[PDB]
Design a protein around this ligand. Structure first.
Ligand SMILES: *Cc1cc2c(cc1C)nc1c(=O)[nH]c(=O)nc-1n2C[C@H](O)[C@H](O)[C@H](O)COP(=O)(O)OP(=O)(O)OC[C@H]1O[C@@H](n2cnc3c(N)ncnc32)[C@H](O)[C@@H]1O
Ligand SMILES: *Cc1cc2c(cc1C)nc1c(=O)[nH]c(=O)nc-1n2C[C@H](O)[C@H](O)[C@H](O)COP(=O)(O)OP(=O)(O)OC[C@H]1O[C@@H](n2cnc3c(N)ncnc32)[C@H](O)[C@@H]1O
Ligand SMILES: O=C(/C=C/c1ccc([N+](=O)[O-])cc1)c1cccc(C(F)(F)F)c1
Ligand SMILES: O=C(/C=C/c1ccc([N+](=O)[O-])cc1)c1cccc(C(F)(F)F)c1
Ligand SMILES: CCCCCCCCCCCC[N+](C)(C)CCCS(=O)(=O)O
Ligand SMILES: CCCCCCCCCCCC[N+](C)(C)CCCS(=O)(=O)O
Lengths: 500, 495
């Protein structure tokens, strides 16, 4: 057996952040990675047509201070996603250009319903602890309904219900009827709320890395040298003896004091455990699927949309549209002009049937209609990735919880199992599901093991992160009217009262 | 490498039934079983205190003709679960004895609501094809709601809603909010409807095997001898070459023409595939969990409940009771007196933190209240099994489908992947979830391979089963009033 202090299972950002922290603390670490590459749900493709393109996780933004600090220490820089010109909301076959993060509504009743929907998402979120969502006062009531049921109760207009549906599909790559209401309200609150999660400027989609996000994992592999073992899928973990034994598919054995599991929770099923997992984890890892998404990038000779005063952002409502959301993916130098689009949830399953050429044609025909531009029918290049086909991811972006699961099984997600500690973005308390959460969880898991070894005290396991000086966060603010305008049922109550 | 015609992954009833059919046709089969035993979600324990006890699947009944034919060929006999005396419904802290399968109600409003609930479950089922529930006319509408939402719409009384909730929890060991309405309605319809699934006399719980259901898998292992490899968990299947390669955790390699996967669908995740699975199966096997149950058997000196004209069946409403359902588990001779109870769904997770002795005390105090007998506080022995703990089952009785999954992924469950064919009770079209469905699926998967080999024609893949002579089925009937009484909103629309 190959002997070390800590085996890290998985070479995504979480496992690589864990391994780097442990290596820097003076321990002997090994990273066992299933694939022929590091990065996991991040993947930067390089070729002469695109130069570089992120086919997995890409965007970072204000309040994501751990990924920004890690990236800066590795010599990486960010640039801003194009948001100079107007955004587009496409609804019932017509485009409506706008500014600001939320598509606006003019109809007064519809205005009250939209304002109440976003306000209520955040009001409910403030009842949910980031590190223990199952402790919310109405946790059981909220966990026993789907997001579809919650929107059916909250939304008194079809306009608000259709926009809210798109919001859920785009944030968690799942249908409203698939996901727990408690879990979704937790997910949004632990990113900083509705405004922060949906925004480009001042939110999650503000920036990208120059050269691609894959460089984070690659530059940590460069620091670790031969400690990273590629094409080593883990099949077996044995904790019955003094040292833990970790076996790989290609017949290698590793012996360690501790293990970090840095893989999505359900992919723990690919490992045979001795002794067996405790009952709650044994069942939890069969109850937590990942979402469904195809990330599609169409290349053009020029960013022609900018000449019509469109920034390249499209919010597209309708069953017929393959893509519900786009962003400008042009390089910061203004060349390799491109539109990035997501095919979400059921549409990722429905359209996986088509050829790559048939998906390109449907996307160009959609963009031509939304942008009112025949130039969208003249692409120069296309790249895509369907994350539903990945054996060692299971989907993208992240793990969703169906109704009933987070209250019954959520407490064991990051509970150690003897000498196994749990990393991965799913175990984060701030931007869980993102590259930020991967760093939070990897570093926290590594510090749990440093505490188990008596190298640090208990109060150093969870550490706050200084604010980035490069990516300052503007606060989220509301207006008097946003806070105090009545809901549609609030207005109806006021009318009933007056006429009495 | 060990060379054979077919590798069967899993030595439960489905894997054993498939291997026996292929062996009987003259093919060389190997069964690779992860555990140090056969039987899977069936397990019969023997000791002097119990003689034998089923800690997993146990009951068989009319219309389950495949498991009855297979067991009879292996030399097994059945006996009837005791249902001579009265059943008990325990409601708001009081026992109400009754006869006939459905607990009765006396309030006229509650009567219409209960009648409408059971009638509506069977009316919806008549629109769901057994072999393709995703082809129901309202498949998307029904798949996109939980059973909790359907019961909220249908049940105008708390009485009906609480009994419907117990019905879901008992049939599929899951909460009403965890499961798809389309999947649950399919599940009931594919067992023959509400009356057939809930009934002891003339339904699924009519009989048990003399000596235990574990004897089905054990006696097929006896026939196959050293073709059954115990403590061989499969870790890797490679289909890139001329022959399929199957590797085990203990470093053995098997080479075959074809493979049968006879494991619960989600336990496919414990196998690394080359090439990778197709996208829809890759995601499906992460979306299909198994239910949660503790099966508990309390032993007594005598079947003392019979002296009060109670048969030992208890249907126990409410959150406080650990056990919602019991049957008499006494042996056919009247000895080894026992009550079998299920701790269901969230209660299995809540009460697993207790000791074995703490669960025994809670069960004995519950039974003393419901049976109105101090004799229930004097157990002579106790056996239990928590199926939530099993690495190579994932739970019991079977796989449930959360909202949205059956319509999006259901078509993939029995679709072959190159030279891998899929067995397991989850792939059956009649009593899927049961030992009957295990036999149907294993024999169908085996005949798909015989057809691929050019040994039988396409029309012999799916084969009907003659009715058992020992366990004939009586027709399910309804009354004029059951068919025509209005619902509660029906009675209101008339007013
Ligand atoms: C896929 C995707 C993700 C994504 C996104 C868009 C798409 C299409 N958009 C994002 C964005 O703009 N900004 C952002 O911050 N996140 C975005 N996401 C999500 C993001 O990519 C993920 O949150 C993050 O990358 C997760 O990192 P983590 O380290 O937690 O997980 P991982 O990347 O999945 O790495 C796990 C590794 O483990 C290996 N593996 C799996 N099984 C084994 C076994 N048995 N043995 C050994 N290794 C194993 C995987 O191969 C992987 O490398
Ligand atoms: C657990 C349970 C089940 C049950 C029930 C009560 C309980 C507590 N009551 C039932 C009843 O009264 N009547 C009835 O007909 N069924 C009842 N059930 C369900 C029933 O037991 C199951 O439907 C049936 O036993 C399923 O059989 P099947 O053959 O489909 O599946 P299995 O028993 O799970 O067998 C699978 C085998 O595969 C092995 N395994 C798993 N992974 C591997 C790998 N990787 N490699 C090799 N072998 C593997 C398992 O160990 C198992 O033996
Ligand atoms: O929810 C959004 C975006 C979310 C999001 C989340 C994650 C990722 N990603 O991980 O890449 C991208 C977009 C989002 C954006 C603009 C408008 C709206 C709308 F208000 F619903 F209209 C919603
Ligand atoms: O649904 C039942 C039984 C189901 C059942 C299903 C499976 C098994 N098993 O696999 O052991 C046992 C009982 C059942 C029985 C009697 C009364 C009721 C009630 F009407 F809901 F009250 C329901
Ligand atoms: C009168 C019927 C209006 C239903 C409106 N919706 C929004 C559909 C339901 C509100 C539910 S709740 O009434 O707010 O609980
Ligand atoms: C009263 N409940 C039964 C709550 C709703 C009736 C359902 S509906 O009114 O038929 O939708």
């Amino acid at each position: 057996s190959n002997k070390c202090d800590v085996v890290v299972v998985g070479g995504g950002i979480s496992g690589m952040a864990a391994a780097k922290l442990l290596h820097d603390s003076g321990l002997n670490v090994v990273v066992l990675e299933a694939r022929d590459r590091v990065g996991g749900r991040t993947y930067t493709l390089r070729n002469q047509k695109v130069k570089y393109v992120d086919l997995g996780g890409s965007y970072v933004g204000p309040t994501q201070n751990r990924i920004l600090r890690l990236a800066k220490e590795l010599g990486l820089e960010t640039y801003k996603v194009n948001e100079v010109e107007r955004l587009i909301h496409h609804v019932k076959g017509k485009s409506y250009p706008f500014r600001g993060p939320f598509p606006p509504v003019w109809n007064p009743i519809t205005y009250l319903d939209h304002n109440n929907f976003w306000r209520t998402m955040d009001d409910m979120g403030r009842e949910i602890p980031s590190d223990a969502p199952w402790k919310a006062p109405l946790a059981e009531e909220w966990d026993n309904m789907t997001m579809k049921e919650l929107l059916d109760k909250l939304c008194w207009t079809e306009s608000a219900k259709q926009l809210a549906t798109l919001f859920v599909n785009l944030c968690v790559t799942a249908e409203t009827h698939e996901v727990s209401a408690l879990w979704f309200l937790w997910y949004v609150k632990q990113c900083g709320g509705t405004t922060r999660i949906i925004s480009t400027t001042n939110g999650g989609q503000e920036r990208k890395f120059v050269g691609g996000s894959g460089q984070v994992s690659e530059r940590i592999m460069d620091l670790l040298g031969d400690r990273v073992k590629l094409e080593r899928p883990v099949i077996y973990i044995d904790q019955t003896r003094e040292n833990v034994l970790v076996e790989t598919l290609n017949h290698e054995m590793y012996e360690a004091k501790y293990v970090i599991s840095a893989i999505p929770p359900t992919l723990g099923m690919k490992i045979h455990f001795n002794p067996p997992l405790p009952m709650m984890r044994n069942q939890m890892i069969t109850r937590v699927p990942l979402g469904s998404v195809i990330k599609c990038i169409v290349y053009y000779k020029e960013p022609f949309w900018r000449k019509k005063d469109y920034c390249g952002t499209m919010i597209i409502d309708g069953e017929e549209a393959p893509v519900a959301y786009t962003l400008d993916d042009t390089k910061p130098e203004g060349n390799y002009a491109a539109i990035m689009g997501f095919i979400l949830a059921h549409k990722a399953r429905k359209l996986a049937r088509l050829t790559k050429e048939e998906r390109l044609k449907k996307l160009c025909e959609l963009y031509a209609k939304v942008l009112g531009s025949l130039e969208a029918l003249e692409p120069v290049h296309y790249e895509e990735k369907n994350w539903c086909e990945e054996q060692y991811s299971g989907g993208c972006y992240t793990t969703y919880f169906p109704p009933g699961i987070l209250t019954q099984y959520g407490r064991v997600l990051r509970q150690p199992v003897d000498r196994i500690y749990f990393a991965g973005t799913e175990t984060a308390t701030h931007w869980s599901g993102y590259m930020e959460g991967a760093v939070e969880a990897g570093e926290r898991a590594a510090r749990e093991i440093l505490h188990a070894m008596g190298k640090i005290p208990e109060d150093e396991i969870w550490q706050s992160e200084p604010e980035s000086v490069d990516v300052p966060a503007q606060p989220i603010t509301t207006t008097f009217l946003e806070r105090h305008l009545p809901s549609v049922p609030g207005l109806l109550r006021l009318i009933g009262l007056t006429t009495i």
